[PDB]
Amino acid sequence: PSWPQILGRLTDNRDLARGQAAWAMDQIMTGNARPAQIAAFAVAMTMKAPTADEVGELAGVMLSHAHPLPADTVPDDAVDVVGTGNTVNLSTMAAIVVAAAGVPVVKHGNRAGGADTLEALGVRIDLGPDLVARSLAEVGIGFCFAPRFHPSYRHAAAVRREIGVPTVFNLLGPLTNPARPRAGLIGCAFADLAEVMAGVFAARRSSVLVVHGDDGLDELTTTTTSTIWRVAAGSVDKLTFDPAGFGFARAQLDQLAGGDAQANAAAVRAVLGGARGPVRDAVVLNAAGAIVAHAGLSSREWLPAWEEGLRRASAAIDTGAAEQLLARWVRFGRQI
Amino acid sequence: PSWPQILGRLTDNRDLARGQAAWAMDQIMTGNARPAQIAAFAVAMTMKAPTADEVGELAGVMLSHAHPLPADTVPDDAVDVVGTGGTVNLSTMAAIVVAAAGVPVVKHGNRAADTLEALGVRIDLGPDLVARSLAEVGIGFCFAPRFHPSYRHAAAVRREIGVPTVFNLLGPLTNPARPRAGLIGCAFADLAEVMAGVFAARRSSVLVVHGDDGLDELTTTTTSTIWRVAAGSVDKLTFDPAGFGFARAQLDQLAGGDAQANAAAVRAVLGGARGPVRDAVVLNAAGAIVAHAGLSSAEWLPAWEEGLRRASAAIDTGAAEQLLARWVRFGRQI
């Protein structure tokens, strides 16, 4: 293959042949692509409209280059909780809540960011595979820092900053978690691509809820209904989801969006401390979603699973388990 | 204005606001663009489908920055003869024939200019000597790097990505001598109409030509699509050389791109060798002469018939051959 062949096919608005998206990503990840070529591909692959096959090839190449976690250190039922983007405030909190409920959580992220909010809370985010594994076992949660696990990605990273608008590369985060969890609640800000992401997870037979707030949030919203793509047994299933059916009062968006890392950390402490309000509700809702996805690994029933998910997430906060888990996560990083 | 605003608008499949393409190109030429931004912009505008307004803004900024020719040195009726690429042999020969017919020609090009160098022509002259060449010889060649230095970053990015983009239109659109007429070839059927719109807006008299076999010149193997530009309007036409008694040729008969080879092909044609290459040269030269005629008035058929007689006579009288010799002599004597 070649750049002119691949870019020419993309500018002609044609889907790529099998292996072409992979070849391209591999050039990018082996330092063999000029910034102009990386940018050209990023843009053309966005404007053509990427397929699940193509996105899966890109994620596949990244994971084939990534540092893995040591063998048998990631439980087969670990989950991820994340949005493509922020609702880092929400996903950070929901992840802690889910871990506290007893579902192993391994996240993947970077500073902008998922990572910023965590280190603001005193968590050590930049850990190698060995210690992420130990964190998962000892604390029940781990965080894989993208530069540490995908160092070959640095050339693409710099180019994304330079062009500064979202591309197909914005989709790859939840799809390139180096711990490779098989379940998750995965938010997508662009509804066009949510269905594509769901297809990618379906191909690897994950149990995920790919979620899109019909108000545009990359998380389950309480502002409006949400679209859920329920991925289980290699199958996708598009549903509309109303948290009103679980008693959630309607909030308005400006109450829910993330802010900077220091502000995110403050809201985390408030919620985990027991503050009620729309932020808590959104956390409980998204945490339950990850639990429902976790349940889908050994698939039972939709409403019962949600009702259980909600009880578990609520109790994890209310008993103080979530708050304690965060405290223990911090102690872990200091004692390591 | 900002790069993320402009690139986001393009990736959203939206036409730019007035001034935005201009701003982008000005950033590119004032050193304030990263290779990645330049590439993203060229690709995004291509996939969005560029408008004549947009491409015009791009060309406008380039020409606003370019080294001009000295005042009153370019005749009001000067013409260009050139294609986008995607027929340097054909356009080089046609330009010589047109100049020898008495229509001032000022070309704009770059090396990959090589074929002319092989013929002994001096390609890298500054504004004053191109002006002198045009007056003394009847033809001048503007070396693109010399007249568009601030464009070097963009030109490099174009090569790095390889795929054709809207940037492939900018060369023929930014002749620094600004001739008002021309035969302009475009290898990309989807961009040729946009390119014609740009020439129309600047009130040029141009034939934008696209061979229906993919050539960026008037072809002899089959029909060509011509966007006829005059009086600020564009008329789309299909052109068939058979209507003027030209036999069909095959694309291979027209082939070659080496320097010594193409120099040899120029000498053979200007020396009177007959066949498909001469026919194609005569066709494209007549087209340039038709565009030249369009500056003042207009009848398409008489114009072509006169263009064809003039092109043929310029070769047959030896005037074209002598003009090249005089061009070579000019550069050697400075």
Ligand SMILES: O=C(O)c1ccccc1Nc1ccccc1C(=O)O
């Ligand atoms: O910055 C990122 O988002 C990033 C993500 C994945 C891998 C590398 C990354 N960045 C870097 C890491 C080491 C040195 C330079 C860079 C750089 O930004 O140029």
Ligand SMILES: O=C(O)c1ccccc1Nc1ccccc1C(=O)O
């Ligand atoms: O071709 C070069 O290497 C070059 C070098 C320095 C300045 C400009 C250059 N090229 C151009 C000039 C005008 C219009 C289009 C181009 C182009 O090549 O796309």
